[PDB]
From a paper:
First, the amino acid is activated by ATP to yield the AMP-activated amino acid, with loss of pyrophosphate, followed by transfer of the amino acid onto the tRNA. Malaria parasite genomes encode two different lysyl-tRNA synthetases (KRSs) that play a role in translation in either the cytoplasm (PfKRS1) or in the apicoplast (PfKRS2), while Cryptosporidium parasites and humans encode one copy. We present a selective inhibitor of both Plasmodium and Cryptosporidium lysyl-tRNA synthetase capable of clearing parasites from mouse models of malaria and cryptosporidiosis infection.
There is a high level of sequence identity within the active-site region of PfKRS1 and CpKRS (96% identity) and an overall sequence identity of 47.7% and similarity of 64.6% across the entire protein. The CpKRS system exhibited behavior similar to PfKRS1: an accessible binding site and a high degree of flexibility of the loop and R295 in the apo-state and dramatic stabilization upon ligand binding, which, again, was supported by the large observed shift in Tm from the apo state to the l-lysine plus inhibitor state. Compound 5 showed in vivo efficacy in two different Cryptosporidium mouse models, the NOD SCID gamma and INF-γ–knockout mouse models. There are very few validated targets for cryptosporidiosis, and here we chemically validated in vitro and in vivo CpKRS as a target for drug development.
Numbering used by the authors:
A (entry chain A): 45 to 545
B (entry chain B): 45 to 189, 195 to 545
C-alpha cells in the first residue's frame, strides 16, 4: 500500500496548495433520503435550474464519461444519488474543473452543489457546479464484504461492514426497534425503568463467573455485575411494585456463537406475580414482538449459513412445557435418586454422565451434574419455544420452593432451538431458607465452582424487611435478536463483539 | 435484636402449626389505586355486603381499638386504604380472630378479603373477613426517615415519598431525551464497556481480566472512540445512554459509575450542537417545571434557595480570554510551551490554586479555568474554544489559533456537557495521541494510550461530525433539586 502513503502525500499537497483541507462545516440542503423522496418521481430529463442545493455522502463510484463529464454515485443514510458534473456548469471560483475533480477518489466523503433532476436515462441526479473534498479515504475499499481479507474483518473493522453491507445495517435497526417494542410493553403496564449498579461489592444473581476490579480511593475490590437481580428485588421491598432494567451484564467465561463477555439483558420484577403469570406474559410479549416484525408466528431460521437449510420456528401459544427432572428420567429410562443433592444421587449422576458420554462438570456438585443432564436430554428437545420448568432447588438458590413438588422450585427457562432465552421464577422471599441456600452457594464456590456466588448479607437484610410475593424474569436481548433477525452468530447482532488476539 | 429473633420464632411456630407460611400467590381483586378510584366518593358509612374483594399492601398502622375491633392502614402503589377488622365478620376457618390478628405487625406485607365501603368518619375502607400474612417484616420500622437511606435504599423508598419522586422524574427525563433524538432520526446503539484500550476522556480507568482470553481489559471511561467508528460506518446519527466507569474520587458530584448520554451527528459542528443543547435542555426544564426558571438548594434543603435561569440564549465564555480577564494578564504563547507552563505555575502560586500533577499545560489550563471561569457559571453557560493541548480529539478552531471547536456546559459551577466538532484529520490525531502517550509515560494517569484501531478507522474517512456528551445524573440533580449525586442514584457507592 503505496495507496495510503500516496494519499497522505496528496493531502499534504492540497494543504500546502491553499486548497480546501478538511472543511469544518458543510451545510446540506437535505438528506439523500429526503432528496430521493422529493425528486425521485420527476420526469426523465427533468432539471430545475432555479433551485440550487447542496448534498453529501460517501463516493461509491466515479466514472469520467468524457473530457467534459464525470458521473459519481454518492451514498448516505441508505440512499444512492448520482452526481453529473459537466465542465460547462463548473464554478471556477472553486478551482479549475479538472483540478477540483482530480482530488476525489472512490471512498471519499464529499459535498456537491447543483441543480436537481433526472438524467435522460432516468437516474435521480444532482447536476453539479462544485465539489468539495470533506474527508478522504486513505485505503482502497472493496465493493462488497466478499472482497475483504477475512470475514473476521466485518467484526474487527465494523465500520467496513456497515459501509458495504446493507444486511448488517438492518440488524442494528431491528435491534433498536425490538428494544423500543419491549420498553413500550412494560411502560404501558405501569412499570418504572431503573438503573442498578454495574460495580458490585458482592456479585450475585446468576450462575456466572465475574470480572474483578478495584476502586483505588474506596480501597475496595469490586465485581462487574453478572446480573441486576439482588438490587432489583430490593426495589420491590421498597414498594416500587413493577420495575425493569435493560443493560449490560458481564460474565467472565467462554466466547462462542451464543456467548459474548458483555451482553444485554432485560430483567423485570412484578409484585404479586408467580411463575405461571410470568409464563403467560412471556408468551404474550414474545409472540407480540414476533408478530410485529414478521407478520405471523411462524418464522424462518437458517441454523447454518444463509447458504444452509431454512427451518421454521413456530411461536404459536401456548408453548410446550418440559418438567426438568421428569424429562431427564425419561431420557435415562430410570429415576434419579432422592434427595437430589444426596451423595447417592451425585454418584448416580456421575455414573449416568459416563454411561451417556456427557462431559463431567467441575466440581461435581449435584446442581452442575443436573445441568449437564438437562443439557443433554432436555434442552435438545427444545426446537420451538419451550419452557423447561420446575428446576431443582439445589440449582436454583433464589427461586421459591415449588408449592406442590418436593425439592423443586417455581422456575422456568425458555429455550428456542436449544438456546436459553429467558430465566424466571417465583422469587424466594423467606429469609431463613435464603440464607441457607447462599451458604450452600458459598460452599460450592470454596470448593472451586467459579459460577457460585458469595453470601450477600445486604440482600438477606433486605429480605428481612419483607419482600412481597413477587415474580421476576430475565431475557437475553442479543439472543432474541439472533432469532428475530435470523442470525446464527451473536457477533452479527453486537456492534463490536469480543474477538481473539 | 430481640424483635428480630422473636419474629423468626413466631414464623417457625406458624410453620409448625400448619398456618399460612409465605403463601406463593395472593390474587388481588384490583390495585389500591383502582380501589380508591372505584369507591372513594361513595356515601359515608356505605358498605356493599354483596361484593367480596381481596386487597394487599404493606401495613403502615395497627390500632387495636378494642378486643373486638382492629384498624389497619395498608399502603401499595402510592395509595393508602384502611382495613376495619371486626370480630363479627371474621371467617373462623382461617383461625380464631385473635390468633389471626396476633400474627400481624406494622411493616408486614399482608392480604385482606372483605367488603368495600367507607367508615362513618368518611375513610375509604375495606371491611374485612380475613387476613393473610404474606411476608413479615422482622425489624421495627422508624415512623419516618442520610447514611441508612443510601445503604438501605428500600427503607428510604418504603418511608419517603420524596425519594420515590426523584426516581420517577429520572425515568421521565430520560424518556424525554430519548424521544427528542428518536424524532430526529437517531439510532440508539450499544458499544463495549470492556475495552482493550481505554479512551475518549481524561480519566483513570478500572482494570480487569478476561480469564479465557488471558487478557487484561479496561472498563470504558467513555464510548466516544467506538461511536465515531459508527459514523465512519455510515450510521449518520447515533446515540448511546449507559454507564461510564472512572476510578477517581467520590463526592457530591462523583460516583465511580455514572450514566452518560453521547451522540454523534454527521455534518454538525459545535455551533449546531450549542443550539441543540439549548433546545433540548430548556425544553426538558419547561416540561418538568412549567418555567425556565427553577429552584435549587446548593447546600441541601436546610440551606438557601437560589434560582437557575435556563432562558436562551445562554451565556458563552471563551476559555482563554476569561482566564486572562481573571488574571489581569495574558498567558504566554504558545500555550503548551515550557514558558507558558512555567508562567501558569506562577499564576497558580499567586492566586492560591492547587497545582496539578504532573504540571502539564493541559492540567494547568484546567486548574485556571476551574478557578476563574467555572465559578462564573451559575445559570447554564457554555465555556467555549478550549486549547488544543487539553482537547486531543477536538478539531482545530477554524479561526482561532491553538484553540478547538469545543464547548463544555456548566450549571452552578458543575460540568454537565462536553462536546466538539470532531477531529477527522488522521495525521494530527495521531500526533495528539502520541502527546497523550508521552503524558502518560511522564505520570499523567488521566492520559490514554494510543488506539491504533481508531486511527485506522479515521483513515477510512470520518465525515465532518459533531459529538456530545451529557452527564445524566448531574442533570437529574438540577431538575430534581438535589445537591448530592447519591440522591439521584438508587444504590450509590458507599465507603466500607
Ligand atoms: O442471553 C444469554 N443468556 C440467556 C439469559 O441467561 C441471560 C440473562 C437473563 F436474561 F437474565 C436470563 C436469560 C447470554 C448471552 C451471552 O452472550 C452470554 C455470555 C456469557 F459469558 C454467559 C452467558 C451468556 O448468556
Ligand atoms: O456527569 C459527570 N460529568 C459530566 C461529563 O463529563 C460526563 C461525561 C460526558 F457526558 F460525556 C460529558 C459531561 C460525572 C459524573 C460522575 O459521577 C463522575 C465520576 C467520576 F469518577 C468522574 C467523572 C464524573 O463525571
Ligand atoms: N438473574 C437471572 C434472571 C432473573 C431470574 C428471576 N429472578 C439470570 O441472570 O439468569
Ligand atoms: N467523551 C467525552 C464526551 C464527548 C465529547 C465529544 N466527542 C467525555 O467523556 O467527556
Amino acid at each position: 500500500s503505496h495507496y495510503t502513503d500516496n494519499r497522505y502525500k496528496m493531502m499534504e499537497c492540497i494543504k500546502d496548495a491553499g486548497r480546501p483541507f478538511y472543511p469544518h462545516k458543510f451545510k446540506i440542503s437535505m438528506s439523500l433520503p429526503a432528496y430521493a423522496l422529493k425528486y425521485g418521481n420527476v420526469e426523465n430529463g427533468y432539471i430545475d435550474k432555479d433551485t440550487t442545493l447542496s448534498l453529501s455522502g460517501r463516493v461509491t463510484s466515479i466514472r469520467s464519461s468524457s473530457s467534459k463529464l464525470i458521473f459519481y454515485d454518492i451514498f448516505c443514510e441508505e440512499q444512492k444519488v448520482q452526481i453529473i458534473a459537466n465542465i460547462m456548469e463548473h464554478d471556477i471560483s472553486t478551482g479549475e474543473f479538472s483540478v477540483s475533480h482530480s482530488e476525489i477518489r472512490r471512498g471519499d466523503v464529499v459535498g456537491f452543489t447543483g441543480f436537481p433532476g433526472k438524467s435522460k436515462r432516468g437516474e435521480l441526479s444532482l447536476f453539479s457546479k462544485s465539489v468539495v473534498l470533506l474527508s478522504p479515504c486513505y485505503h482502497m475499499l472493496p465493493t462488497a464484504i466478499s472482497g475483504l481479507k477475512d470475514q473476521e474483518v466485518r467484526y474487527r473493522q465494523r465500520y467496513l461492514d456497515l459501509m458495504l453491507n446493507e444486511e448488517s445495517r438492518k440488524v442494528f435497526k431491528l435491534r433498536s426497534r425490538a428494544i423500543k417494542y419491549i420498553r413500550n410493553y412494560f411502560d404501558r403496564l405501569g412499570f418504572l425503568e431503573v438503573e442498578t449498579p454495574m460495580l458490585n461489592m458482592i456479585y450475585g444473581g446468576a450462575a456466572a463467573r465475574p470480572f474483578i476490579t478495584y476502586h483505588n480511593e474506596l480501597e475496595t475490590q469490586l465485581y462487574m455485575r453478572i446480573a441486576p437481580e439482588l438490587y432489583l428485588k430490593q426495589l420491590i421491598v421498597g414498594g416500587l411494585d413493577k420495575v425493569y432494567e435493560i443493560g449490560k451484564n458481564f460474565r467472565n467465561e467462554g466466547i462462542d456463537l451464543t456467548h459474548n463477555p458483555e451482553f444485554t439483558a432485560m430483567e423485570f420484577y412484578m409484585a404479586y406475580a408467580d411463575y405461571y403469570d410470568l409464563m403467560d406474559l412471556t408468551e404474550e410479549l414474545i409472540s407480540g414482538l414476533v408478530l410485529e416484525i414478521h407478520g405471523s408466528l411462524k418464522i424462518p431460521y437458517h441454523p447454518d449459513g444463509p447458504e444452509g437449510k431454512c427451518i421454521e420456528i413456530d411461536f404459536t401459544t401456548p408453548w410446550k412445557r418440559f418438567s426438568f427432572v421428569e424429562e431427564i428420567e425419561s431420557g435415562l429410562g430410570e429415576k434419579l435418586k432422592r434427595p437430589l443433592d444426596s451423595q447417592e444421587n451425585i454418584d448416580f449422576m456421575v455414573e449416568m454422565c459416563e454411561k451417556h458420554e456427557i462431559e463431567l462438570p467441575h466440581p461435581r456438585t449435584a446442581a452442575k451434574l443436573l445441568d449437564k443432564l438437562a443439557g443433554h436430554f432436555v434442552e435438545t428437545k427444545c426446537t420451538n419455544p419451550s419452557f423447561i420448568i420446575d428446576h431443582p432447588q439445589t440449582m436454583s438458590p433464589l427461586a421459591k420452593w415449588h408449592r406442590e413438588k418436593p425439592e423443586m422450585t417455581e422456575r422456568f427457562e425458555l429455550f428456542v432451538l436449544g438456546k436459553e432465552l429467558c430465566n424466571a421464577y417465583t422469587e424466594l422471599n423467606e429469609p431463613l431458607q435464603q440464607r441457607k441456600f447462599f451458604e450452600q452457594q458459598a460452599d460450592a464456590k470454596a470448593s472451586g465452582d467459579v459460577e457460585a456466588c458469595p453470601i450477600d448479607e445486604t440482600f438477606c437484610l433486605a429480605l428481612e424487611h419483607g419482600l412481597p410475593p413477587t415474580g421476576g424474569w430475565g431475557l437475553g436481548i442479543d439472543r432474541l435478536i439472533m432469532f428475530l433477525a435470523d442470525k446464527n452468530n451473536i457477533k452479527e447482532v453486537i456492534l463490536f463483539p469480543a474477538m481473539r488476539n
